[PDB]
Design a protein around this ligand. Sequence first.
Ligand code: CL
Ligand code: ZN
Ligand code: ZN
Lengths: 29, 29, 89, 88, 150
Amino acid sequence: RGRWACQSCTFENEAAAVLCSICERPRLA
Amino acid sequence: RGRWACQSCTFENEAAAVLCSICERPRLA
Amino acid sequence: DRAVLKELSEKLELAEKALASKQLQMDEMKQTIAKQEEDLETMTILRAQMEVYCSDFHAERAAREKIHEEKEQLALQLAVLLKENDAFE
Amino acid sequence: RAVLKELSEKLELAEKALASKQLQMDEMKQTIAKQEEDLETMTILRAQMEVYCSDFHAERAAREKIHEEKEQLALQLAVLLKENDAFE
Amino acid sequence: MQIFVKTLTGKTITLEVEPSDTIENVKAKIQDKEGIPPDQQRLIFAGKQLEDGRTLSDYNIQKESTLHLVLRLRGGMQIFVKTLTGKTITLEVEPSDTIENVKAKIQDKEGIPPDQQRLIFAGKQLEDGRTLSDYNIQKESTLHLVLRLR
Ligand SMILES: [Cl-]
Ligand SMILES: [Zn+2]
Ligand SMILES: [Zn+2]
């Protein structure tokens, strides 16, 4: 867990998100 | 909550599955 | 710790909602592919027209050359009669 | 059973399933892009078809013009023959 | 801007223009690049077929890209060539064409080497180095082909 960086757009998401808040791509995609 | 019935193809999936084993659609879709 | 169960249960429910959302989006995209493939069928009619218009052009030019040949003979007949009339001026 | 282990394993399963679904959407997104390329090629095909249509019209116009010139000559000729026969 | 084009078959030699050139100057760079005359080509960029009398920057022609261009079946001026056998053939020409260019066009239609062609117009023998304009040859004018007997 913890905050995570979107691998596509680099937005730093909160640990509770399963999709990136900006580009909507999933954490593991 | 027990096995869940896929609303698109009616297959009864195991509680631990998140996708339907036959048609691969998610439980809430 | 009871909150830990609440974190996972809440995040799982979020993941499963995100799945239904992605699936519904894929369903929409599948229709888009379907409509666009339907639009592409209009290409068969388009190419047929292009061949017709292209074919009609050549025919028109062929006809134009024949009528030219005919115009030339007429023009010559005319000149022969006019020079013959011209001789008595 | 271990609920925390059970919830954890399903959430990891959900997140893998999400990645999987996203990779499928990426494929369809590329298909839609190829179709849009083809649809642009269909518009260009439409343009080419219109040019041929236009050139057809122009050639037909030219053929009609020379055909009309031929007719006016046929008439001039007819006038000369009626005049020439008037001597005979 | 070095700018290339894609076609049905493929033909592109060293070319180059900048968006400042007119819509007829772009068709001019295609003259020595694509090999078809200017009034036989109609150019289109992203669904906009720009005509002459509109700057090429008004709707910026992106530099160094691959464009699709469509070609006409005919130009704006045809002359007729008549064989002694009566056959008439149609040539796409321009007033700046020399009669030597016209003979090269006849060879392409009839397979006769230009050396073997004599051309007659207005009752006079035409000379290779002159142009259709020098002879006042105009749209739908008629030349007469005679082959050399030598
Ligand atoms: Cl000689
Ligand atoms: Zn992102
Ligand atoms: Zn199912």
